[PDB]
Design a protein around this ligand. Structure first.
Ligand SMILES: [Zn+2]
Ligand SMILES: [Zn+2]
Ligand SMILES: [Zn+2]
Lengths: 69, 131, 46, 115, 124, 105, 196, 147, 57, 787
């Protein structure tokens, strides 16, 4: 669904780094690796957390029984 | 054994302890002497020359393997072959031809229109080992 | 041993031999009191 | 008989040179596809056995020859229509069949098998 | 036309009856009442040989160009692995592999001794 | 070995009709040829005292294959070609045109 | 799971003799002197005779299997353990098999050396009416690989032909577990009721 | 071997080759009763033996010049019982059950097999563990709880 | 289970303080016993382990 | 520089569902045999299978109990007024809802939420012909709500782009292929059935135990009608030397002498039958005697039958009751009706000459099997089978229900004429009265089949089983759901057999049936899954232009040649024997056909055509050039070495074909084709397994079963669903280690797991063989949490 709060392995907050990661890939045009480093993710456990995140919530939200069309 | 105590076992066997004075060649010759020999085992070719004249003439020629070949492979003599053909085989052949003539004249053909017999848990059988 | 009626009602013989039978299902074997069932988990400290 | 509809009887039939003397006479049968034009070709290259080669307007052909039922009907007269050929039934001396053959390309191994 | 034990009409092609069943001197076709015979049909014969596969024997097997029987002595087990023999203590020990039970269950190994010839079955 | 052709006839003249293995016939009867007007279909018909002959051309074979018959010379080495249609001929007997009631019991 | 450069050299050299084995065994069962070529017309006719008979194919399979399995045993005896990069007690894969904790030297050899000949219902790989064991192999191919002999190991990986053949032998066991009507339930129930 | 067969004009067509073929594989040249084939296997634990695919002791008794008649083994328990007695059949049961387990390298104490064999031979016959063998048992309640 | 047919039941939910800790300061999310691999021969998982680590870094 | 994951591309597509062509075409190619099968029911040439089916069931006759009163022997013979009832056209409508006046569109989402069926109005133009069309009455009759397949010809979603699907409460890349019946998604399971229009020489001990002096040898051809209904014809070799024709009508088997069924088709002589079976091999004493037994036996048993008409009349007289064709139909009409409906139906009506040629070929193949010249064809092998698609099966049972529907109209009229007599057939009032006294709800009957899987039929079709034709399209996770539409079963009847040969993985399955993806235990080797690049034939085309190409390539016409046996090559196109050639030339034609097939220069030769060449062998398969183009065929793409272009291959032709796996393994003079990627031989789930070429065989198999049982993502449109039970992983993650085909199927839309730090360690003491440890602090942080 959404970006998890804290890394499953150690507990480093990762939830504030999702939207910032896409901005480093889009606007800054950086590679996956360097973008994660600039966010402050050096442990491979914290690295995979954001890198491997799917974000199905954006797909899920497109079905809204409260708004027409 | 335990469940049925069968008098009619699938593979009935006998273990025969051979002496020391009986050689490996002698024992193999003895094996041949007891082993069941069929006419099929000594025949190489059968040529039937069906000629109709005057009467259905059937010239049956029994081409066997060489005399020394089947005598060394089945321990069967030419005299032994003569007795079986002249007493068993011809009487068995005559009975088979007579039976085939009767079977030909009995039923002329299958009955047309009359139905004949057909040639030949469901979810449980489709369940995998983990299911 | 009774005539076919247009599955029939089971007789007292059928009651004693329903499946495995009254003797096998309720005498030789029985459901018991003061008993529990659970998935087993390993433990080297016990 | 008279049936089927749209079928007209053949009154005029061209002459066939049939004699069968003895320095002898030979009757040949040839099979041809609908794609090739018989009136265009005025010469046909053919040799004994299965080995044959032919090229008519980009298309390649092969004339299969076989030694060995069909019955030949030759017209005796235009009014007598058709009658069975005989000398003493009649069989063809040599039978041929034209088959369209295409040249399959050799595999470019140096281009397809790559380490 | 006459072919082997069969005889067909040259006019229609219907199979003609046996000369023994019908009346003597003359024979006729069921389709067209054609004048027959020409008396040149003769007492025909048909040479019928055995199936060659009809008599399966130890001698017929030996007549085959390829090896049909394996030697009693020349029988090498199925492979050899360096495993300690439980019988006395041997290095050379034969083996066999297959996957029994579930797809989750491990691989079963079937060991075989060389010194005595003792079979085995152990998963781990 | 290139063999030369003298003449080619695209008009009906000589025809070939396959019956069966061992066909003789009285060798005095006539066969009436018919034609229909891309590819022309031919029909053969003959009559006898005890027999009757009927032939036709295969629809799948006519449009795809073109059969020709020629006469060869041993000295001149020239062939006179004439188009011949192959007719699948069947022979009907006096025994034919025999039938029982349309509905029996 | 790794072999040393020395140990891996031994593996490739013993497995280099396995290519000849396929045709050698095929020439032995067929009975042909001087060891005829793999593309010999008389040999290919002789192998067809073998293909049509269940017994004749059995003699061919048992001879070729015993010969390729002898090549397997050689690879395993040389490479394990004298050719393994990491050695006992530190090589835990080796340690678990020797200690009896889990696994055997057979599993260890499939991982580090070769899977060997894939045996299906006592014989080799099933063959089509065309004489082909797979659409990739030549009809009546006199090669060990075509018969199901896997030179590949699970460490280095297995080729698609070997993969399909391993799939056959792997499933074969699970099929036997599905078709096994024999149960010890009633046999024990009959004894216990009379011996209680 | 050549022989001519004369049939009537009414017998007409017949497939003689197929008829002959079937009778040849049915015709026995020589057969010793109840025995099909006698083979020579590899000596079992050093013992020179011959394995028969059939059972007839009285026939083998005549082959005293080749076979040691006091050591002639057989897997068929009922056949052994009929000729050599209940104790011999009892010994065949303990040996045969042991062959089933020893092949799969499973060791079962002979104390178990001997008890099972003694229970099968308790009536001097060869009783099996089933409804038939059970008929000769005192407890009707035990019988009722079986089937 | 991993994508290599190595299924196992959850024996316990081990505390991070009691869990083995890496040089990096990471404690594993899941612990697989080494005695699983010699019988199953799931080497695909072994190469998946060093591939997944390389790709995460 | 790498084989990376699309992160920026993925998230953009999540927010923006495409308005153009949907992404991941392979996902739609997975449900291609399902949607295509149902699409061919109405759309395509000849007006679809359903219009062909009602054209094949024909008329249903009943006569009025009224006299002629003519000023006569005609009065006694007068049966009354004729009533021939049939169905000309069959219409299917997209799901609608009327409220009695104006109709409204009803979408699948509504059907799921309402817990109802996604039905479409079934219409069929009934023909009420009196006294052989002296007055005709037509009426378009509403025959209930027929359950429609999703994303098909009659579904509202088929046109819709990913954007439109989301706006209609469905998945962005919705596959379809299933039916919404009472809120439950149910699909028709694909079946493995005998390859159409091919004589199969089979040895079966079953054939012996049925009758007297019956052998193991026999021939079996599964003839299929253009409407996809099948009719199997079996040939039996009796020990007497007699050959009998076996068939089935209603649910009963019937036996007739082959020499009788031959003489009924077309007028022939005994020598024409002789030349037809025995070619130039006249000296073969084995054949010389067997054929004499047939011809003399027929002359002995039936001496009266001397012409084609008498034979047809004798056949009509004995089958007038079973075929129910009565009481004005002559024995000649009933006789021909038996032939047209039973004997080699794949060649159909106005093809009796073709049926005669094919029957003689079957007798020669039968005699080659008895002698040993020919090895028996294996029915369990992939080469001698095709795949009965769900949509085709649906069309077959529909044809059965409309046949029943017409029988019921006649039954009501028979009730009427046997009592009150009522009125005449020319009155529209009477027709309307009969029609509303007949149960016309075919929709409910078709809804039953999709709700129970139980096959209720008068013929029983050409299938052995009667249950489990339908299964719930289980959506516990997408991996299990997509595998359903790629799963194929041999048959429920085969599951209850001691034979292991059926379950055995064979080389014939290479690239068609996946070697990995098969369940453990009871369904092992029975419940197979197709390869990801494997395709199934929906129809046939350009088949009529191929004989012209063959005849030009040197194929001698079968009508003129008259020579048969294994000594010569037999050329056939969809079971239609067209000619005869030598075995040398036979391969030349087969190789040159493939060349002009891959080349886009030839208009009459399609790339999807199967060229099944069988070379001559010593006691091997029956040789011939058996070409195929028809429906249900198994097809796969390969790279053809000359020209370097794609070629479509079937399991029958592959057996003799040399296809290299990798281009580096291509051997000279012994290879004609090469694979595109070896990944083409595996299923979707089998390809998704990382480094599967490094794992032991049963572990790769168990992973397919595992991924199917995982708590992953069953969908994202859940707020508009009402399913029995769903399992949803909250924190889904994209695999770092993955096959590139994971993206090709867009599996990121449905994550099945999570990337975890896994240490291969024995430390806690609680982990050992079947037990593993999970981190407490990881679980506390939401690791592997599900709902
Ligand atoms: Zn972390
Ligand atoms: Zn006649
Ligand atoms: Zn030892």
């Amino acid at each position: 669904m959404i970006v998890p709060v804290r890394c499953f392995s150690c507990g480093k907050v990762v939830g504030d780094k999702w939207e910032s990661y896409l901005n480093l890939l889009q606007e800054d045009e950086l590679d996956e690796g360097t973008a994660l480093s600039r966010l402050g993710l050096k442990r491979y456990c914290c690295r995979r957390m954001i890198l491997t995140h799917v974000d199905l919530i954006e797909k899920f939200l497109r079905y809204n029984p409260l708004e027409k069309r | 054994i335990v469940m049925t105590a069968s008098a009619a076992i699938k593979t009935p066997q006998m273990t025969l302890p051979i002496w020391n004075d009986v050689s490996d060649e002698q024992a193999d010759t003895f094996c041949k002497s007891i082993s069941k020999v069929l006419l099929s085992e000594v025949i190489d070719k059968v040529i039937v020359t069906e000629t109709t004249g005057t009467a259905r003439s059937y010239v049956i020629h029994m081409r066997f393997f060489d005399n020394n070949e089947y005598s060394e492979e089945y321990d069967v003599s030419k005299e032994e072959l003569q007795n079986v053909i002249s007493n068993q085989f011809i009487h068995l052949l005559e009975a088979a031809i007579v039976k085939e003539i009767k079977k030909q004249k009995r039923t002329t053909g299958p009955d047309i229109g009359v139905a004949v017999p057909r040639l030949q848990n469901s979810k449980r059988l489709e369940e995998d080992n983990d299911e | 041993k009774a005539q076919g009626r247009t599955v029939p009602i089971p007789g007292v013989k059928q009651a004693l031999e329903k499946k495995e039978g009254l003797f096998r299902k309720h005498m030789m074997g029985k459901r018991v009191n003061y008993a529990a069932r659970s998935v087993i988990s390993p433990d080297p400290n016990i | 008989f008279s049936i089927p509809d749209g079928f007209k009887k053949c009154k005029h039939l061209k002459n066939f040179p049939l004699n069968g003397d003895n320095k002898q006479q030979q009757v040949w049968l040839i099979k041809f596809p609908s794609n090739v034009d018989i009136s265009k070709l005025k010469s046909l290259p053919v040799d004994f056995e299965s080995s044959t080669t032919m090229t008519i307007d980009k298309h390649d052909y092969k004339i299969m020859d076989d030694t060995d039922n069909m019955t030949l009907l030759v017209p005796s007269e235009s009014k007598e229509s058709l009658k069975i050929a005989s000398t003493a039934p009649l069989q063809f001396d040599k039978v041929f069949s034209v088959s369209e053959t295409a040249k399959i390309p050799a595999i470019d191994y140096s281009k397809v098998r790559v380490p | 036309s006459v072919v082997g034990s069969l005889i067909f009409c040259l006019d229609c092609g219907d199979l003609l009856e046996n000369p023994n069943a019908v009346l003597g001197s003359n024979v006729e076709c069921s389709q067209c009442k054609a004048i027959y015979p020409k008396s040149q049909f003769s007492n025909l014969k048909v040479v019928t040989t055995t199936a060659d596969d009809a008599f399966p024997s130890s001698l017929r097997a030996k007549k085959s160009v390829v090896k049909t029987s394996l030697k009693k002595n020349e029988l090498k087990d199925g492979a050899t692995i360096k495993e300690k023999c439980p019988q006395c203590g041997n290095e050379e020990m034969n083996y066999h592999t297959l996957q029994l039970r579930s797809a989750d269950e491990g691989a079963t190994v079937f060991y075989t001794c060389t010194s005595c010839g003792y079979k085995f079955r152990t998963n781990n | 070995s290139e063999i030369e052709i003298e003449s080619v006839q695209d008009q009906p003249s000589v025809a070939v009709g396959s019956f069966f293995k061992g066909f003789r016939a009285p060798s005095d009867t006539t066969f009436d040829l018919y034609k229909k007007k891309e590819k022309d279909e031919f029909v053969l018909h003959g009559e006898n005292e005890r027999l009757e002959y009927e032939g036709y051309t295969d629809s799948s074979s006519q449009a795809s294959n073109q059969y020709v018959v020629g006469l060869f010379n041993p000295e001149k080495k020239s062939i006179q070609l004439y188009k011949a249609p192959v007719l699948v001929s069947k022979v009907v007997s006096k025994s034919s045109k025999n039938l029982r009631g349309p509905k029996i019991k | 799971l790794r072999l040393t450069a020395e140990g891996n050299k031994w593996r490739t050299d013993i497995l280099k003799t396995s290519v000849d084995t396929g045709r050698e065994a095929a020439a032995e069962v067929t009975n042909l002197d001087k060891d005829t070529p793999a593309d010999d017309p008389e040999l290919l006719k002789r192998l067809q005779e073998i293909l049509r008979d269940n017994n004749k194919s059995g003699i061919l399979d048992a001879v070729t299997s015993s010969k390729v399995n002898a090549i397997t045993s050689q690879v395993v005896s040389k490479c394990v353990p004298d050719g393994t990069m990491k050695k006992f007690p530190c090589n835990s894969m080796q340690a678990m098999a020797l200690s009896g904790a889990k696994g055997s030297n057979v599993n260890v050899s499939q991982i580090m050396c070769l899977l060997g000949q894939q045996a299906l219902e006592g014989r080799r790989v099933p063959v089509m009416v065309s004489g082909k064991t797979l659409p990739s192999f030549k009809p009546y191919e006199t090669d060990a690989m075509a018969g199901g002999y896997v030179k590949g190991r699970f460490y280095s990986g297995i080729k698609p032909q070997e993969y399909y053949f391993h799939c056959m032998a792997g499933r074969e066991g699970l099929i036997d577990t599905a078709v096994k009507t024999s149960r010890s339930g009633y046999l024990q129930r009959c004894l216990t009721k009379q011996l209680e | 071997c050549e022989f001519k067969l004369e049939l009537a004009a009414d017998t007409e067509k017949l497939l003689m080759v197929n008829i002959v073929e079937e009778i040849c594989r049915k015709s026995i040249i020589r057969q010793i009763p109840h025995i099909d084939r006698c083979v020579h296997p590899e000596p079992e634990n050093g013992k020179r033996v011959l394995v028969t695919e059939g059972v007839n002791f009285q026939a083998m008794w005549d082959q005293e010049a080749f076979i040691d008649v006091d050591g002639i083994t057989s897997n068929d328990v009922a056949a052994v019982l009929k000729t050599y007695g209940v104790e011999a059949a009892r010994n065949t049961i303990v040996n045969e059950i042991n062959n089933v387990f020893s092949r799969y390298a499973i060791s079962v104490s002979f104390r178990h097999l001997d008890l099972i064999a003694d229970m099968m031979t308790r009536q001097g016959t060869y009783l099996a563990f089933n409804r038939q063998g059970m008929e000769t048992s005192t407890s009707s309640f035990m019988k009722m709880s079986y089937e | 289970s991993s994508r290599h047919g190595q299924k196992g039941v959850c024996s316990r939910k081990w505390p991070t303080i009691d869990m083995p800790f890496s040089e990096t300061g990471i404690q594993p999310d899941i612990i697989i016993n080494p005695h699983a691999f010699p019988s199953r021969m799931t080497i695909g998982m072994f190469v998946e382990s060093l591939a997944g680590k390389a790709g995460a870094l | 520089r790498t084989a990376d994951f699309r992160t920026l591309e993925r998230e953009s597509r999540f927010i923006n569902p495409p308005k153009d062509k949907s992404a991941f075409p392979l996902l739609q190619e997975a449900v291609q045999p399902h949607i295509g099968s149902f699409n061919a029911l109405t759309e395509g040439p000849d007006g679809g299978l359903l219009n062909l089916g009602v054209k094949d069931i024909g008329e249903k006759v009943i006569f009025d109990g009224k006299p002629l009163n003519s000023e006569e022997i005609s009065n006694s013979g007068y049966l009354g007024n004729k009533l021939s009832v049939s169905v000309e056209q069959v219409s299917i409508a997209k799901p609608m809802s009327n409220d009695s006046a104006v109709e409204r569109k009803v979408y699948p989402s509504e059907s799921r939420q309402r817990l109802t069926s996604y039905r479409g109005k079934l219409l069929l133009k009934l023909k009420w012909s009196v006294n052989n069309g002296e007055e005709n009455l037509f009426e378009v009759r509403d025959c209930g709500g027929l359950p429609v397949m999703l994303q098909s010809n009659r579904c509202h979603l088929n046109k819709m782009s990913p954007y439109e699907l989301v706006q209609h409460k469905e998945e962005s890349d919705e596959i379809g292929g299933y039916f919404i019946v009472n809120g439950i998604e149910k699909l028709i399971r694909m079946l493995i059935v005998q390859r159409r229009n091919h004589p199969m020489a089979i040895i079966r001990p079953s054939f012996a135990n049925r009758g007297a002096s019956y052998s193991h040898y026999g021939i079996q051809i599964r003839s299929v009608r253009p409407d996809q209904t099948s009719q199997t014809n079996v040939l039996h070799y009796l020990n007497d030397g007699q050959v009998t024709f076996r068939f089935s009508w209603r649910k009963n088997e019937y036996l007739v002498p082959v020499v009788m069924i031959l003489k009924a088709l077309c007028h022939t002589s005994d020598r024409e039958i002789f030349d037809g079976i025995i070619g130039n091999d006249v000296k073969d004493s084995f054949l010389t005697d067997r054929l004499e037994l047939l011809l003399r036996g027929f002359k002995k048993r039936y001496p009266h039958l001397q012409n084609r008409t008498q034979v047809l009349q004798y056949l009509g007289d004995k089958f007038r009751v079973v075929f129910q064709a009565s009481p004005d139909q002559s024995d000649l009409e009933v006789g021909q009706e038996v032939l047209d409906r039973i004997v080699l139906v794949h060649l159909g009506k106005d093809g009796s000459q073709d049926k005669f040629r094919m029957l003689l070929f079957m007798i020669r193949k039968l005699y080659s099997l008895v002698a040993g010249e020919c090895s028996p064809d294996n029915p369990d092998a992939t080469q001698h089978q095709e795949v009965l698609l769900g949509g085709f099966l649906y069309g077959m049972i529909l044809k059965e229900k409309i046949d029943e529907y017409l029988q019921n109209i006649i039954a009501q009229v028979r009730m009427d004429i046997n009592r009150g007599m009522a009125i005449n057939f020319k009155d529209k009032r009477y027709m309307s009265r009969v029609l509303m006294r007949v149960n016309e709800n075919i929709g409910s009957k078709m809804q039953y089949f999709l709700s129970t899987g139980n096959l209720v039929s008068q013929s029983g079709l050409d299938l052995q089983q009667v249950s489990g034709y339908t299964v719930v399209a289980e959506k516990i996770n997408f991996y299990r759901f997509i595998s359903h539409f790629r799963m194929v079963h041999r048959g429920s009847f085969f599951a209850q057999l001691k034979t292991t040969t059926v379950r055995k993985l064979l080389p014939e399955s290479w690239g068609f049936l996946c070697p990995v993806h098969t369940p453990d235990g009871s369904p092992c080797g029975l419940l197979n899954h197709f390869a990801h690049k494997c395709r199934i034939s929906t129809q046939q085309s350009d088949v009529s232009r191929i004989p012209s190409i063959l005849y030009s390539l040197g194929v001698a016409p079968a009508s003129h040649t008259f020579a048969a046996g294994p000594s010569l090559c037999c050329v056939q196109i969809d079971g239609k024997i067209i000619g005869w050639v030598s075995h040398e030339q036979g391969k030349i034609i087969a190789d040159t056909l493939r060349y002009w097939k891959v080349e886009g220069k030839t208009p009459g030769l399609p790339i999807d055509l199967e060229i099944g060449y069988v070379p001559p062998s010593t006691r091997g398969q029956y040789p011939g050039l058996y070409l195929f183009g028809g429906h249900s065929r198994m097809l796969r793409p390969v790279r053809y070495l000359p020209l370097d272009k794609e070629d479509i291959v079937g399991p029958f032709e592959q057996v003799y074909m040399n296809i290299a796996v990798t281009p580096q393994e291509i051997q000279n003079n012994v290879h004609t084709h090469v694979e595109f990627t070896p990944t083409n031989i595996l299923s979707i789930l089998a390809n998704l397994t990382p480094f599967s070429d490094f794992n032991q065989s049963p572990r790769n198999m168990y992973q397919c079963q595992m991924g199917k049982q995982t708590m992953g993502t069953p969908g994202v449109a859940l707020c508009h669903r009402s399913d029995n039970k769903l399992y949803r992983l909250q924190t889904g993650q994209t695999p770092i280690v993955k096959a590139n085909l994971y993206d090709d199927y867009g599996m990121d839309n449905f994550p099945n797991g999570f990337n975890a730090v896994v240490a291969v360690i024995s430390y806690t003491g609680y982990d050992m063989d079947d037990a593993m440890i999970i981190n407490k602090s990881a679980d506390e942080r939401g690791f592997g949490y599900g709902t």
